[model samples]
Target: PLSQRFERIAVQPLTGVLGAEITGVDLREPLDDSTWNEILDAFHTYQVIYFPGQAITNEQHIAFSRRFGPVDPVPLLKSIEGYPEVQMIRREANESGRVIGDDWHTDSTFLDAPPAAVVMRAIDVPEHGGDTGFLSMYTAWETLSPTMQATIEGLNVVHSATRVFGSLYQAQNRRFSNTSVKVMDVDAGDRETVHPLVVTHPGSGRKGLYVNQVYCQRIEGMTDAESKPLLQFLYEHATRFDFTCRVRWKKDQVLVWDNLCTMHRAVPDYAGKFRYLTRTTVGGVRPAR
Candidate 1:
């Protein structure tokens, strides 16, 4: 729609609410002020941006991510050989369940400061079915009834790495390995913190639904038993198809979505398919109302 506003770049909306597939520009090269400014605008306006047909190196990817902020290296996941900053978000066909992030959630919400954005670059993808899905929490928040909005306005969600990555779920689902590959032997279940159930975006000043299906365990000051039904409802509401868009991967497609306003899930539809992706995250300040 706004094709002529920028030089050598095009931002085409992928869906009504969630994503844009960007083209006509390459990430491997440095961006000028005018191009970079528009890219940032498109990023926030859509919440998720897809860069297609790029051939960028790992160093170039990390360099590109630094334009947003400092790079956030994942603590427990295996890194790309020498570049500890890049994390391998891989799912092997032989692994248990053979699925990664098959549930709706933000990235590392259990940390004291959850990240602002996560960029997933497809290294390898199945011939069919391995699309990632995204939904807008901004849309989720605005569409809710006033009563439901008021009910959660002054509340918080308790998040824990132990709930999913600790002995709790890892006992049943795990990555069998040489036992000496990564530094951490088990999921580092150390970070346990609370964040607002609805956070205001520090940049845009828009409120968004913050609870997610995976990391968020309970309402703050409420027991897990007492918080389940409401949390479940929010999780379901946050991921409704009306607010959704799916990213079907092509070789070398890079997707960068804001963790502050989107919920995403990996689709593991191909039974014996293999998928591999590399991710670089940029951290945000502590979430606030």
Candidate 2:
């Protein structure tokens, strides 16, 4: 009965940050019912999965992401010209380059409802040093001391776009102001959303430290002065080398990661070399207590 109901796929992790190489399958075509279930199970198990050497069209990418959940059209930021679901990530040497995510962050942490998962495919890559990094919140929480765990459990944190991207937006002189920027939602300009300092994964039953250094401004019920020392300490702890992993990009490599249970950052050290990546995220349910 078990063999009839489920199909097995091989998955090997690339690094500690958050990626697994799924072999023995192709996602471009429609999957068998059992294969789809196996892939979803693997996705939840390893927060991020990487598929190399597979050519994925924009429509195919969106279609593949939808199997897990609803497709989240990136309303706040510009996406691929024709495919509304795909967002372009480009950084070059000549441009007045935007480098907002120099530190660790979970995408759209400032929003009322952040994405469940994000799928990124590398279009161009450098020979070396343009690696994207990830941190597993699942591992982060498990490794914390009992005292540290309890401390986070009792607290709530303020996730704000103003603290993270506001200065960058202002520096750009409002040239980029539009409804499509991920941080600029209907309620984004006026209010900051609060999420639990500790978040539990819906499928895995694991708890992850949810605040990120980039978008999380302060802890609820604490002043800036009061929150700084502790906040900085946790940031350091969460992003420590032991808790992180790095993925060396390859052309046409597709990566998908759970935004709810992990944090990631793009390393833009390869400025002179051309680097481009396309991303699409799937919508997540509201954080449950």
Candidate 3:
């Protein structure tokens, strides 16, 4: 079913499964109560929503992001100078490094309480290749065979940032050696938390596959060798193209996404191109099924 209309904005779903493009309402200006509610409605319905041509400052971006929930700091990425909750992703055109978020994963799943959602604005981007793709984990769960669903229920999944941000892990890595992005407080990334394998979205009450290939290491209590095939199978299955939507970013476009029910990846085809973006994450409660 299509989403209901709102008096304050026009919403066009990007795909039947995941994303919507919202038109109307400027992020630079304070949103009226009605407009904000409409945006929130679209966010929950679409999983991911983008507002094209939003030219907002750091303050405005933080203000709008906070409406989804309170700010949740991204522990690995460096924040903007004055705004502690706003993280900057700046990649120069001449660099030979991978872009941030190149992995297919949820943001900050390693935290005891992962972020509820993320708000991002494209400050600048390559002419053609820096599009982002979102996958609906809600559909990932719903499409599973009945037996497969039951088999994975009551399971615990482990998540950690150790491999991605820990000092020893990245010290020998080439991916970030040439990039301008700064990753700080590597020690903090060692935190690990476990959550249900199948989680229910707090807002929509929809079940979703909670395990991701990046932060999710193994099924709790299972050995890596034992857990590898299952997690790998799910990693591949959850990313099927049928459940995804890609957003070709425009400079100044502001996108909002629900982290609990979706996963996102940055297309790294923009080699030798400049890309700058800012992100703000909203606080979330613990995950549950």
Candidate 4:
């Protein structure tokens, strides 16, 4: 029944930290029922899908993203006017420049219900460099040794935006200005939430490694001294090249990736070059233990 409706598209596993080229389709035009189903199937299988040579409008981008799930509202620090569901990612090399994703992170890991997926469109790209790196959480979990996997199975990690974004806000003396940075304890108040260190993909039923370097602070019930080594090992293991992929942008290129099972970082190698991207995230239910 599924085969009758869905057609196969090119599927390529990424070779490195930052680039994959997925050809054979256009995302600009409206997708018919069967074609759209195929596209969704490809995304579920590949974890990341690239659409080059298509110029997609913001409205079109939002429409396509909503097909996956409801759009997530941007948090306080990165909120955009009028369209809280969309977040603009810009990187510039100047005295006042704030690097976009200079470190590895899953978007909005600070939240109780992290986003399901993110759709990004490249508007401006550097001539020589500037690429986004993505790591596959599913692969990361699968590659771990059985012993290591068992160790993390019953654990939960603390995820806080303050741990990752605090430096910038601290330098500006606006640390408390943004309430989004507060720690979310899974056992506590209305805002606090905790997720399993390992998560199951809603649609595919595959398991994913959910610890991110940016937001994950410490394992629950473990002292910092006891947790550091394991955390460091996981941080290193999860980002290994075999589990990663990259996307090199061309003008008007669009990419959609699963945020629940991936972590991404933007390279700032092109210091003087300008880079701009617009992103929309799809919301999902919180991952359960």
Candidate 5:
């Protein structure tokens, strides 16, 4: 049973699945024992916590984020002015195709240790479009039949950055060198690493499907010819609407998601409109089976 102290916070479910709006707490203020516990519980329970009306400073953002884990640096991303740890997630209305997490993926999975959490605040939200969608990999893994689950239990899949941002993110003729590194320029060595198809969440001890549609290029030991159909099915299955939640960003709203248990995609419906955000990511240890 939730104690009386936890009741101080309000949790409004965003969907029947796994997103919630957390209220009655101010992020900028220093947290006491009660508020910290409630936030911790809510973070694991919802997998993503949306704190509305939090017009907070970068220092406040970094402080709150540090409570979860150490802030991780985002390579190949543009950092906010002066704050190296903060990633500026801006989108140009004129750019062709959806950029920056348009596909269902977890951040920095290409690294041996992916960021454990991502805290983002909507700085400039477009009126007509731009809602980020999240899918529960925990539920995605759970719903599969026992037979299919067993089939994937022992397999490992490769997660690649060069494949997703390899060509597109490194657009030519960009004045800022920040977004201008080609895939070949950075020595990826092998270009990808194999991780278990299913990973246990370090905090919750819950196993979730770790493969993503975006950077998970192929299953190990299988040729591209062989892996295509299966890869197609797994990713398609990961994005099932029934197992997902959508967040419509309002200006100054803050959202932090557990990267270990969810896969997310951004909708670029806000073309010709401005959409900007600042993100803070926390690092994690290498994933295991």
Candidate 6:
């Protein structure tokens, strides 16, 4: 059992599972390694953590993200001026299609080297809604029956970007438009990657259910007919209410989450209200057992 003390900062669980609100420290200050390590310990333990009232600048956000790993570029989204690693997660009032990240997904699973984590700072938010919910895939994997877990551990899942961001979808849908954010290219979606259905977390060495409803398309070597039922079941099972936690966004709050072991979705209830956040993803290697 872990018994590390957070003498520099405190963590309060958002729920019994998966998320926490970290308090008692200003993110803008140049934190010592001891303090940063404790924060990271809390991060790995909780899977997601947020610091309210951080109000850090874009440069500071990038620097903070690099502490976890290399800040990776968010393909297809517009980067902030002079900061290629930062993407503006913007949604204006009264747009089309679903809000960004409306369904359960881990960020960029289609990449061969999928991102390890993401840091997002809420710049503007609505009066009432737009909270993001997180579900722990580690818990999702552990809760499965032994037989079920055995059945999936070595299976390969095929993830694709074309299904969501391909030219066809961009042409038919207006969700990518009518916003402050710009899409650089619609053809970037033609990429695919194969990963284990159950992935080993790089930091914690824990196994997590890896497939998500957004980018995950099919099981390798299996026909769509053969794969649909199982994939659909896992997707539904991974998102059960008890396995998740929600974070209500506060302006200037900085939130970070492990993209490998958690899937998150924004609640789109604030349709007439605007929500804006800035995001930076950290790099990782190709996933393997």
List lDDT for all candidates, in order.
0.82, 0.76, 0.86, 0.72, 0.81, 0.86
- Checking candidate 3 for backbone clashes, the offending pairs are none
Roughly what TM-score does model 2 have, to 2 decimal places? Answer: 0.88
**Superior candidate under lDDT, 4 versus 6:** 6
Model 3 poorest 10 in a row by lDDT: 174-183
Model 3: per-residue Cα lDDT over 173-277, one tens digit each: 655642435555676766678999999888888889998987988999999998999899898889999989999998989999998999999888887888889
Cα lDDT, model 3, residue 115: 92
Candidate 6 displacement at residue 106 in angstroms: 0.6
Clashing pairs in 6: none
Residues 1-289 of candidate 2 have per-residue lDDT tens digits of 3243335667786664566788777768877887888888878777878888768788888888888788885445667688878886766645444554567888887778889998888888887867878889888878899988877787888876664356544455434323234544434543678998888788788788887887788899999999999889888888889888887889888888889888888786776777778888889876655
- Order the candidate numbers by TM-score, best to worst: 6, 3, 1, 5, 2, 4
The positional error of residue 232 in candidate 3, measured at the CA in angstroms, is: 0.9
Pairs of colliding residues, candidate 5? none
Give per-residue lDDT, candidate 5, residue 84.
Answer: 87
lDDT of 4: 0.72
Candidate 4, run of 10 with poorest lDDT: 174-183
Ten-residue segment with the worst summed lDDT in candidate 6?
178-187
Candidate 2 whole-model C-alpha lDDT, 0 to 1: 0.76
